[PDB]
Amino acid sequence: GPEEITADIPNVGEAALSKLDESGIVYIGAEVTGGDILVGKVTPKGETQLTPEEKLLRAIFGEKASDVKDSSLRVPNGVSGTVIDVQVFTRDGVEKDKRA
Amino acid sequence: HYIGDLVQRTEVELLKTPNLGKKSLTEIKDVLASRGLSLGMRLENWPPAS
Amino acid sequence: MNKEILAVVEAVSNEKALPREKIFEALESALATATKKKYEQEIDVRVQIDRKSGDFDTFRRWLVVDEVTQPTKEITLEAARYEDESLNLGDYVEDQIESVTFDRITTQTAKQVIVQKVREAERAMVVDQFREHEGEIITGVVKKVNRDNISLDLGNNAEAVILR
Amino acid sequence: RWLELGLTDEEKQNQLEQLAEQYDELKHEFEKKLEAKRRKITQGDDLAP
Amino acid sequence: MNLTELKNTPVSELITLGENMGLENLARMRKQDIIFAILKQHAKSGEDIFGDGVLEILQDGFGFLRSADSSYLAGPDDIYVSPSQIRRFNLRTGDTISGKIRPPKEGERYFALLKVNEVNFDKPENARNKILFENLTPLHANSRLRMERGNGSTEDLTARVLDLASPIGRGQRGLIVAPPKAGKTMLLQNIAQSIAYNHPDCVLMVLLIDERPEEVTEMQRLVKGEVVASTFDEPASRHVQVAEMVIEKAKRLVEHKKDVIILLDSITRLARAYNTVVPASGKVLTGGVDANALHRPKRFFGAARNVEEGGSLTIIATALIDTGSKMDEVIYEEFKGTGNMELHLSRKIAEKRVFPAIDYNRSGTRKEELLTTQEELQKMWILRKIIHPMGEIDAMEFLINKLAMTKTNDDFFEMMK
Amino acid sequence: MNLTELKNTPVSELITLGENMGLENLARMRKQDIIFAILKQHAKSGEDIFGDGVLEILQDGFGFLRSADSSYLAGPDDIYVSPSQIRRFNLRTGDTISGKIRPPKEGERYFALLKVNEVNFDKPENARNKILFENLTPLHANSRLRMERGNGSTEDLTARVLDLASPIGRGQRGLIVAPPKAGKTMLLQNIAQSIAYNHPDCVLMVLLIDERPEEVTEMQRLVKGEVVASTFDEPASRHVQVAEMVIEKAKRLVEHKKDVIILLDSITRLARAYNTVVPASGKVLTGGVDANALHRPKRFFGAARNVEEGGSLTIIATALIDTGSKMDEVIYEEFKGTGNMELHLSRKIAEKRVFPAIDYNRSGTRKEELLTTQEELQKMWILRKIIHPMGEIDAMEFLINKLAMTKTNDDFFEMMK
Ligand SMILES: Nc1ncnc2c1ncn2[C@@H]1O[C@H](COP(=O)(O)OP(=O)(O)O)[C@@H](O)[C@H]1O
Ligand SMILES: Nc1ncnc2c1ncn2[C@@H]1O[C@H](COP(=O)(O)OP(=O)(O)O)[C@@H](O)[C@H]1O
Ligand code: BEF
Ligand code: BEF
Ligand SMILES: [Mg+2]
Ligand SMILES: [Mg+2]
């Protein structure tokens, strides 16, 4: 399965995920001090059968996200700063997300 | 042209003036709410000293 | 966005314990608290989304009363004869449109409200289904026996309690 | 919004229609540039195989 | 400004007014948005607006006041009324409202109501505590509707024969059973003319469903009363809409103690439109007819009655038969023992250029003793017993020759002795 | 350069012109792109282009001007017109436009309009402030269309019998009810020939929907007026496209005070195509027919009327029956009480080599008093009363023998006395 940038990141509190939007990317202008999440990337480490009804159920109910691996990129340790710009490039066929 | 001349009156006359819609009325009422005072009061000391 | 609201209302988990009008009212309350969190003031607003297909068209409640406290939801009786109100309570007018019902905090509060509403719905359903067996005897395994009371499995999401 | 009137047709209307045609050509060229910039900044980019 | 002056005025005066107001090019759009923009401009430079119409309450909660000339159709000309009026004055669907209205701001486009003035031609105080329609006690017709004008024209003899065959009264149900090609249009036209000339106090309403538009325009300005019609040009949704509109208007008017008279043509086409508009219930007979599909038409025909408290409602719906299909046939079978006054118009006499083609042998009316006097009824029975052994065309020409010489049915009866 | 000279010219002269211009191998492609490249070359070496056609406005905002010979189909020959013209001249769908056009540069491929010259055969100033179609007041037909030519040929007697059975006028609705195998094609051809020979001032339009292509090509160059036809070769999308095209053209022409006459064949096939092209609404009767699927055809048949202000529109749509399916049957039932002039052509007389097979007993026209004089109507009624007791084949041969000797219907009537 292909990896996605959905805002469904398990094994993390909502306070750490508050810096991201509904599309899983930090808002333009949100500073970060230490190692924190800025892009909500997840990859399916399992098999098929990922149905949209299951997606909307897991978004509200159900157990944790089964196949994610938490492949989301975080800012390296020690380096700080304030985000000022985000760029996105998408392959043809793939629909652009709301931030794009 | 003065705030005190507006605090001591209700908005029944505000809607009587044309071009006074939801925008202006809501803006004035929310500004006076953020300022704590109420639209429509009763005071006699006016205007000191103008 | 309306397509997603549809997908949600038609793709609910418990179509029986959560009827369609219940999904409508739950989404309305979720979007209402979202719009409440939007503005810095406190103003109660319902969305009245088209139950069948269409999108939302919010309103603005104003609570006709001679008071002035929180004037965002205040309309005096004397200064209300315009717009043919002529009433004492129920001035829920359409002064407010342009609700955003898909951003991050709105989605989170909507998910929370939906969880609360489905919990309330399943509670009401189990209670008014298994209350008919009030005089007769009920059989069922015990979920868990606590100190103050014990809770019992009676069936599909069926709970009973026996006091200490 | 009312560029078009009628008086002394034989030459006044000829000049007015020439001007209106120039205006329409300018508007079409501007819409063309708009659409070209749109399809250039919205075309899907190539990233990697 | 009042609404009806701009509604029932020709569109040319509206074009002139809109051009004089210094507005956009007005003649390029519908009459609806034309008058909408005209009212908006007159409100921007002028006083409050004065509107009127009939009220329809949707499943949404609010109400729409629609005009009579557009057959109560949606558009910019409708009047939005909030549920607050429906809670204060306790409004109902079909309420004839007339009052003050205001222009719309952002978020709205319809003229909102400001203050009602006349509700069903009555004061809101008197209309507050009233009696419902279904709560009334139906009865038989007692006051007979005189259809003879007295002049004895070339065609009023038709109406005369009608008085000879079907005494109509306030609260009776009339079913005109006639195949096509038979000449019922001018018959109903003359009936409406006579009933408006003899009884101008009672409201008169006609309804043309699935009818040709030319007949609609030639009837909407030839007879009295609002001529509401839903031609075949529109789907069945508009037909059921106007059916509910007219039936609720009649119910409200008879609740306000007014003698209401409905002329419906034809009832088979209305029932067919009902059948195709309401969802199916699974059970289907021959001809593509559903079981519940006739429930609403039946109700519509059963609304007519003679109220004991005040006023009455008399419907006259014609049933089109002999078309080849089974829909009309099963409709006429279901409505056969329904109306208490049938009038049969056989095409055999119509094709022979003998008008009015009236099957006097098969026509009749029940409880006619409560509409005519004693000797009048005796003469009618004598005439019936005399004509019954005769056929149809011969009896028709005999009646025509015996009625052409006389001018009044009374002299006719005494000369027939 | 004008467009019509290159449109209605044979393709051979186009091949010669393209070979003389020193171009690519031209005969290897469609006529459409052939004439497109020819116009492009003539514009590269020459003056402005002069085009014409009928305008269609999409849901996109712009407009396409399409020619009559391609049945108004998409291709390189269309003319793109910006919404700026639709805002300035306030254009509408179906506007007959003719004017100057320019070649396209990069980003474009259609010839863009430069300046309109003739809009619906009228000046833009006169067409600016006008009257809408639906805003007109329909009426009954007053001017009768004379179908007798006077020569009395071997086949014009058909038209004569038509004048004997269905007096056609400006604003009437004609429904030809005939099973297959019955000979209606040459009937409509002769009707068109006679109505163009007797009334050459009024525009004549024919429409062949779901028809064989050979008949299309043999009719497109035998009768007058643009012969627009959508054969069965294409899906129903093109059928509804050409239906809207022709109906909007007729509406614009009658708005410009022109007597428009439409010949539509057949209406059952057009309604079937409508049924399969418009999305379903859930409700379905027997035969695979939807409720709203007949709304647009109904409208199409209801567009015809007699305008009181100026001009009129007369449609003559034939209904194909007796095919076995239920679609045609339910269509003919829905359109039975729709047209005000039916003409029945029974196959029993057609199979006996007795033409024209016309069911005179079941045929007729309403309000014929407004089309014929007094003694003419009296003679027609006498003839109807005489022929009615007879059957179909015997009456048909009697009428044929009585009409072959005479040359004019007047002498026929006086000799029938
Ligand atoms: N009372 C009458 N006197 C003279 N002619 C009549 C009379 N009633 C009907 N007709 C004739 O019969 C025809 C009926 O036409 P129409 O109203 O279309 O039929 P229907 O009423 O069956 O729909 C008319 O053309 C008219 O000439
Ligand atoms: N007026 C007429 N005179 C002679 N023959 C006729 C006439 N009308 C029809 N026919 C014959 O009937 C046939 C009808 O063919 P066609 O046009 O396909 O029928 P339809 O138009 O009913 O489909 C023709 O072959 C023709 O020979
Ligand atoms: F009988 Be008609 F078609 F009204
Ligand atoms: F030409 Be046939 F009547 F289809
Ligand atoms: Mg009729
Ligand atoms: Mg044929």
Side-chain angles (χ1 to χ4, degrees):
Chain A
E3 46 192 333
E4 308 309 304
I5 312 296
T6 79
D8 194 348
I9 306 95
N11 305 329
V12 57
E14 197 62 34
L17 303 181
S18 53
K19 295 178 179 177
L20 308 185
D21 77 320
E22 69 272 48
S23 85
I25 295 93
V26 61
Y27 310 94
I28 298 179
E31 55 272 2
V32 53
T33 43
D36 204 319
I37 180 57
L38 74 162
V39 291
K41 165 174 298 152
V42 289
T43 183
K45 55 184 171 56
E47 68 278 4
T48 187
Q49 180 249 349
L50 275 301
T51 70
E53 58 267 34
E54 191 269 331
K55 306 300 207 321
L56 59 89
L57 190 70
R58 179 172 286 173
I60 317 178
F61 316 103
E63 77 290 335
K64 57 157 293 186
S66 311
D67 307 318
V68 284
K69 197 43 187 59
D70 200 4
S71 86
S72 288
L73 159 77
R74 275 77 65 85
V75 62
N77 53 339
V79 54
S80 163
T82 82
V83 55
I84 67 176
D85 193 7
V86 286
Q87 295 290 142
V88 294
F89 304 109
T90 73
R91 181 52 65 96
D92 314 277
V94 183
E95 55 93 19
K96 313 172 186 178
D97 78 315
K98 53 162 301 302
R99 202 164 200 86
Chain B
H1 304 264
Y2 303 93
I3 295 178
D5 284 312
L6 190 55
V7 189
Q8 204 181 357
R9 51 155 290 162
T10 66
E11 59 99 11
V12 57
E13 190 205 343
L14 283 183
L15 261 62
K16 285 297 183 178
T17 312
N19 311 118
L20 273 297
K22 62 188 66 57
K23 179 255 298 180
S24 45
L25 189 76
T26 45
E27 281 167 358
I28 302 307
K29 72 167 64 76
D30 296 0
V31 163
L32 63 93
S34 45
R35 292 281 79 79
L37 59 96
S38 158
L39 186 54
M41 289 297 303
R42 291 267 68 89
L43 59 93
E44 190 49 51
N45 45 1
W46 191 245
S50 171
Chain C
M1 180 51 186
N2 188 27
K3 50 200 182 308
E4 182 175 8
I5 309 160
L6 286 192
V8 166
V9 63
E10 281 100 17
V12 288
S13 158
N14 305 269
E15 282 87 345
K16 170 63 214 64
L18 167 58
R20 208 58 65 90
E21 78 282 355
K22 206 150 197 179
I23 315 165
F24 298 152
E25 71 206 39
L27 266 298
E28 283 164 349
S29 44
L31 272 46
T33 176
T35 49
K36 179 65 67 68
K37 294 303 176 301
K38 285 174 145 300
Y39 287 164
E40 56 275 354
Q41 280 71 234
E42 287 77 17
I43 176 62
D44 48 351
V45 160
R46 83 195 173 284
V47 300
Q48 198 48 259
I49 181 167
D50 308 298
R51 293 179 185 269
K52 188 260 298 176
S53 87
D55 46 299
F56 46 80
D57 50 350
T58 50
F59 286 84
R60 189 165 179 177
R61 312 173 176 265
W62 287 85
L63 276 298
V64 165
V65 58
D66 298 318
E67 211 170 342
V68 286
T69 59
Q70 189 67 217
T72 65
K73 46 180 58 178
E74 288 278 358
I75 281 299
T76 72
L77 278 81
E78 319 96 301
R81 317 311 301 176
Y82 196 49
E83 295 108 354
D84 193 10
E85 311 172 43
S86 310
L87 78 166
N88 204 290
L89 180 61
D91 52 352
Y92 312 144
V93 307
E94 210 181 60
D95 282 340
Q96 211 291 317
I97 313 99
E98 184 258 345
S99 47
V100 193
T101 82
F102 41 82
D103 58 78
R104 177 60 180 273
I105 177 62
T106 55
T107 310
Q108 296 307 317
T109 191
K111 167 203 58 180
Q112 189 269 351
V113 167
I114 283 306
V115 167
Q116 305 320 292
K117 283 300 299 172
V118 294
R119 188 202 64 252
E120 293 181 352
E122 61 88 14
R123 282 173 176 170
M125 289 323 291
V126 61
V127 74
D128 67 3
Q129 284 312 106
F130 282 74
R131 182 206 34 78
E132 306 294 332
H133 307 88
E134 48 190 1
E136 47 267 47
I137 313 302
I138 310 101
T139 309
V141 196
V142 290
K143 293 178 174 63
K144 195 188 312 301
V145 298
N146 306 332
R147 187 189 60 87
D148 204 339
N149 70 323
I150 78 178
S151 86
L152 288 79
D153 273 315
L154 309 187
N156 47 356
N157 188 206
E159 56 91 8
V161 285
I162 300 181
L163 273 302
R164 174 192 192 86
Chain D
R1 69 183 187 277
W2 290 118
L3 168 58
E4 300 75 26
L5 295 173
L7 73 163
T8 313
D9 282 15
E10 59 272 30
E11 58 90 13
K12 293 294 296 183
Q13 283 315 305
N14 288 334
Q15 277 80 248
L16 264 294
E17 291 304 322
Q18 288 283 157
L19 190 149
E21 189 267 345
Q22 297 300 138
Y23 166 77
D24 298 329
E25 188 271 339
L26 183 79
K27 291 299 296 298
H28 188 55
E29 181 266 349
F30 266 95
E31 291 296 329
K32 281 191 52 55
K33 295 304 178 181
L34 198 158
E35 200 59 38
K37 189 63 62 60
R38 164 71 174 179
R39 66 170 157 269
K40 176 170 299 301
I41 70 181
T42 51
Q43 63 101 12
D45 292 314
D46 190 7
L47 289 77
Chain E
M1 184 173 56
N2 273 339
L3 181 58
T4 82
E5 44 196 68
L6 271 67
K7 292 300 286 181
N8 322 113
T9 187
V11 321
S12 201
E13 186 197 28
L14 294 177
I15 296 187
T16 76
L17 192 152
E19 290 300 87
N20 290 16
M21 290 305 300
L23 291 208
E24 196 264 332
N25 248 311
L26 217 78
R28 276 284 185 181
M29 22 169 170
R30 189 167 272 159
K31 103 160 331 288
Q32 221 171 19
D33 31 49
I34 273 172
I35 192 169
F36 168 75
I38 287 178
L39 290 185
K40 275 205 59 180
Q41 192 64 27
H42 183 88
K44 290 175 185 178
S45 37
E47 68 275 355
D48 52 345
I49 312 100
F50 276 92
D52 65 319
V54 175
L55 174 59
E56 160 201 358
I57 303 163
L58 274 301
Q59 82 288 328
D60 260 302
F62 53 79
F64 277 156
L65 203 72
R66 300 183 181 182
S67 68
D69 44 320
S70 79
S71 27
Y72 315 99
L73 261 55
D77 54 350
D78 66 343
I79 302 310
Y80 184 93
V81 39
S82 185
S84 156
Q85 290 85 346
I86 313 172
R87 300 310 178 281
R88 197 179 327 278
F89 297 90
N90 277 320
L91 306 182
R92 208 175 293 103
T93 304
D95 283 333
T96 301
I97 315 296
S98 45
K100 171 180 48 182
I101 48 171
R102 67 159 185 82
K105 38 183 171 59
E106 332 316 41
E108 331 298 333
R109 68 198 164 281
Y110 302 152
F111 287 81
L113 190 149
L114 285 185
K115 169 63 182 306
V116 318
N117 293 135
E118 216 61 48
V119 173
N120 317 334
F121 304 145
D122 203 333
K123 184 179 183 182
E125 291 308 332
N126 279 27
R128 192 62 54 85
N129 158 8
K130 59 175 301 181
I131 178 61
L132 269 295
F133 175 79
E134 64 278 352
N135 300 20
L136 300 164
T137 91
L139 213 62
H140 300 272
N142 307 327
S143 83
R144 188 192 186 277
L145 297 173
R146 282 302 176 184
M147 312 310 296
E148 174 192 3
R149 184 176 301 182
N151 55 3
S153 83
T154 288
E155 187 263 354
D156 292 332
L157 59 86
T158 58
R160 299 179 67 178
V161 186
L162 177 127
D163 278 324
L164 285 225
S166 305
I168 179 61
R170 301 190 193 272
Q172 203 76 6
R173 295 197 176 100
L175 251 146
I176 315 302
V177 180
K181 267 337 155 151
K184 55 177 175 56
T185 305
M186 66 291 293
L187 184 136
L188 261 67
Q189 287 170 3
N190 177 34
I191 285 308
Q193 292 167 26
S194 42
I195 197 162
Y197 183 82
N198 302 334
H199 313 269
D201 55 331
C202 60
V203 63
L204 175 58
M205 289 145 153
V206 300
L207 201 65
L208 306 132
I209 305 304
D210 301 3
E211 194 65 28
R212 276 84 62 192
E214 308 90 344
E215 280 158 302
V216 179
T217 98
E218 73 95 15
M219 286 188 62
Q220 74 174 3
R221 55 168 100 183
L222 189 148
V223 299
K224 287 92 174 182
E226 61 271 24
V227 174
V228 187
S230 178
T231 177
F232 67 92
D233 264 300
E234 289 75 36
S237 51
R238 175 171 164 265
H239 298 289
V240 43
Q241 172 62 34
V242 305
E244 309 329 286
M245 269 293 209
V246 64
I247 204 65
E248 295 311 319
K249 192 172 184 176
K251 284 181 181 180
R252 299 308 98 85
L253 276 170
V254 77
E255 278 162 329
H256 279 219
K257 301 179 179 181
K258 299 203 187 279
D259 289 323
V260 188
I261 299 172
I262 311 300
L263 272 296
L264 187 133
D265 100 276
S266 103
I267 195 176
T268 69
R269 293 183 160 276
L270 178 62
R272 179 184 304 173
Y274 264 111
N275 165 267
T276 155
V277 68
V278 58
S281 42
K283 302 138 183 292
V284 159
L285 247 85
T286 185
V289 127
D290 204 316
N292 62 330
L294 299 180
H295 164 238
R296 311 183 64 175
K298 277 178 181 182
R299 284 185 63 256
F300 197 102
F301 199 83
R305 57 207 61 180
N306 185 20
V307 183
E308 198 190 333
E309 286 79 8
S312 341
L313 169 57
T314 293
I315 205 180
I316 303 287
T318 124
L320 228 134
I321 72 161
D322 191 359
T323 75
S325 66
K326 292 307 270 217
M327 303 178 199
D328 53 324
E329 303 294 332
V330 303
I331 285 160
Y332 161 65
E333 304 310 89
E334 293 301 324
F335 292 157
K336 166 176 291 295
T338 303
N340 48 22
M341 176 259 289
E342 14 199 316
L343 176 49
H344 300 270
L345 317 180
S346 178
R347 202 204 309 179
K348 185 186 63 179
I349 317 179
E351 64 180 354
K352 213 194 170 184
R353 209 51 173 167
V354 184
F355 299 96
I358 293 183
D359 198 338
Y360 178 77
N361 290 329
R362 300 193 306 176
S363 206
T365 316
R366 288 93 67 92
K367 299 306 177 182
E368 63 207 337
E369 293 82 4
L370 313 180
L371 292 177
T372 59
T373 97
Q374 211 11 353
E375 64 304 346
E376 195 178 26
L377 179 71
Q378 287 289 338
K379 294 173 181 60
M380 286 178 182
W381 276 117
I382 288 304
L383 179 90
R384 172 86 63 176
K385 186 180 179 180
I386 287 177
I387 298 303
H388 186 272
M390 309 180 65
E392 294 186 352
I393 299 180
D394 47 354
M396 198 63 242
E397 45 165 338
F398 167 80
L399 179 54
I400 288 298
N401 287 70
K402 291 308 165 301
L403 204 65
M405 40 182 59
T406 183
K407 309 306 292 177
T408 116
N409 42 20
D410 175 33
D411 295 3
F412 165 82
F413 275 125
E414 262 138 86
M415 287 192 311
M416 282 296 322
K417 303 184 306 177
Chain F
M1 184 173 56
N2 273 339
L3 181 58
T4 82
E5 44 197 68
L6 271 67
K7 292 300 286 181
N8 322 113
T9 187
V11 321
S12 201
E13 186 197 28
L14 294 177
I15 296 187
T16 76
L17 192 152
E19 290 300 87
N20 290 16
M21 290 305 300
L23 291 208
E24 196 264 332
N25 248 312
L26 217 78
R28 276 284 185 181
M29 22 169 170
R30 189 167 272 159
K31 103 160 331 288
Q32 221 171 19
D33 31 49
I34 273 172
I35 192 169
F36 168 75
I38 287 178
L39 290 185
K40 275 205 59 180
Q41 192 64 27
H42 183 88
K44 290 175 185 178
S45 37
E47 68 275 355
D48 52 345
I49 312 100
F50 276 92
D52 65 319
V54 175
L55 174 59
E56 159 201 358
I57 303 163
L58 274 301
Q59 82 288 328
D60 260 302
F62 53 79
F64 277 156
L65 203 72
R66 300 183 181 182
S67 68
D69 44 320
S70 79
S71 27
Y72 315 100
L73 261 55
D77 54 350
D78 66 343
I79 302 310
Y80 184 93
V81 39
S82 185
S84 156
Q85 290 85 346
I86 313 172
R87 300 310 178 281
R88 197 179 327 279
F89 297 90
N90 277 319
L91 306 182
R92 208 175 293 103
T93 304
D95 283 333
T96 301
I97 315 296
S98 45
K100 171 180 48 182
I101 48 171
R102 67 158 185 82
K105 38 183 171 59
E106 332 316 41
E108 331 298 333
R109 68 198 164 282
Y110 302 152
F111 287 81
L113 190 149
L114 285 185
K115 169 63 182 305
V116 318
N117 293 135
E118 216 61 48
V119 173
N120 317 334
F121 304 145
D122 203 333
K123 184 179 183 182
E125 291 308 332
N126 279 27
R128 192 62 54 85
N129 158 8
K130 59 175 301 181
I131 178 61
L132 269 295
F133 175 79
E134 64 278 352
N135 300 20
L136 300 164
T137 91
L139 213 62
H140 300 272
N142 307 327
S143 83
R144 188 192 186 277
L145 297 173
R146 283 302 176 184
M147 312 311 296
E148 174 192 3
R149 184 176 301 182
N151 54 3
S153 83
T154 287
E155 187 263 354
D156 292 332
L157 59 86
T158 58
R160 299 179 67 178
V161 186
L162 177 127
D163 278 324
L164 285 225
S166 305
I168 179 61
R170 301 190 193 272
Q172 203 76 6
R173 295 197 176 100
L175 251 146
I176 315 302
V177 180
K181 267 337 155 151
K184 55 177 175 56
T185 305
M186 66 291 293
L187 184 136
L188 261 67
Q189 287 170 3
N190 177 34
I191 285 308
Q193 292 167 26
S194 42
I195 197 162
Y197 183 82
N198 302 334
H199 313 269
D201 55 331
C202 60
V203 63
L204 175 58
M205 289 145 153
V206 300
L207 201 65
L208 306 132
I209 305 304
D210 301 3
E211 194 65 28
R212 276 84 62 192
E214 308 90 344
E215 280 158 302
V216 179
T217 98
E218 73 95 15
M219 286 188 62
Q220 74 174 3
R221 55 168 101 183
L222 189 148
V223 299
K224 287 92 174 182
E226 61 271 24
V227 174
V228 187
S230 178
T231 177
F232 67 92
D233 264 300
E234 289 76 35
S237 51
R238 175 171 164 265
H239 298 290
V240 43
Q241 172 62 34
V242 305
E244 309 329 286
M245 269 293 209
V246 64
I247 205 65
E248 295 311 319
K249 192 172 184 176
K251 284 181 181 180
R252 299 308 98 85
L253 276 170
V254 77
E255 278 162 329
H256 279 219
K257 301 179 179 181
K258 299 203 187 279
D259 289 323
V260 188
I261 299 172
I262 311 300
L263 272 296
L264 187 133
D265 100 276
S266 103
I267 195 176
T268 69
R269 293 183 160 276
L270 178 62
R272 179 184 304 173
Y274 264 111
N275 165 267
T276 155
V277 68
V278 58
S281 42
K283 302 138 183 292
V284 159
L285 247 85
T286 185
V289 127
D290 204 316
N292 62 330
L294 299 180
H295 164 238
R296 311 183 64 175
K298 277 178 181 182
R299 284 185 63 256
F300 197 102
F301 199 83
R305 57 207 61 180
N306 185 20
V307 183
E308 198 190 333
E309 286 79 8
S312 341
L313 169 57
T314 293
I315 205 180
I316 303 287
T318 124
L320 228 134
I321 72 161
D322 191 359
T323 75
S325 66
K326 292 307 270 217
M327 303 178 199
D328 53 324
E329 303 294 332
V330 303
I331 285 160
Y332 161 65
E333 304 310 89
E334 293 301 324
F335 292 157
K336 166 176 291 295
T338 303
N340 48 22
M341 176 259 289
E342 14 199 316
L343 176 50
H344 300 270
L345 316 180
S346 178
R347 202 204 309 179
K348 185 186 63 179
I349 317 179
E351 64 180 354
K352 213 194 170 184
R353 209 51 173 167
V354 184
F355 299 96
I358 293 183
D359 198 338
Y360 178 77
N361 290 329
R362 300 193 306 176
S363 206
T365 316
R366 288 93 67 92
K367 299 306 177 182
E368 63 207 337
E369 293 82 4
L370 313 180
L371 292 177
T372 59
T373 97
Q374 211 11 353
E375 64 304 346
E376 194 178 26
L377 179 71
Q378 287 289 338
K379 294 173 181 60
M380 286 178 182
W381 276 117
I382 288 304
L383 179 90
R384 172 86 63 176
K385 186 180 179 180
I386 287 177
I387 298 303
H388 186 271
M390 309 180 65
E392 294 186 352
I393 299 180
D394 47 354
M396 198 63 242
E397 45 165 338
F398 167 80
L399 179 54
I400 288 298
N401 287 70
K402 291 308 165 301
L403 204 65
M405 40 182 58
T406 183
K407 309 306 292 177
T408 116
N409 42 20
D410 175 33
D411 295 3
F412 165 82
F413 275 125
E414 262 138 86
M415 287 192 311
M416 282 296 322
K417 303 184 306 177

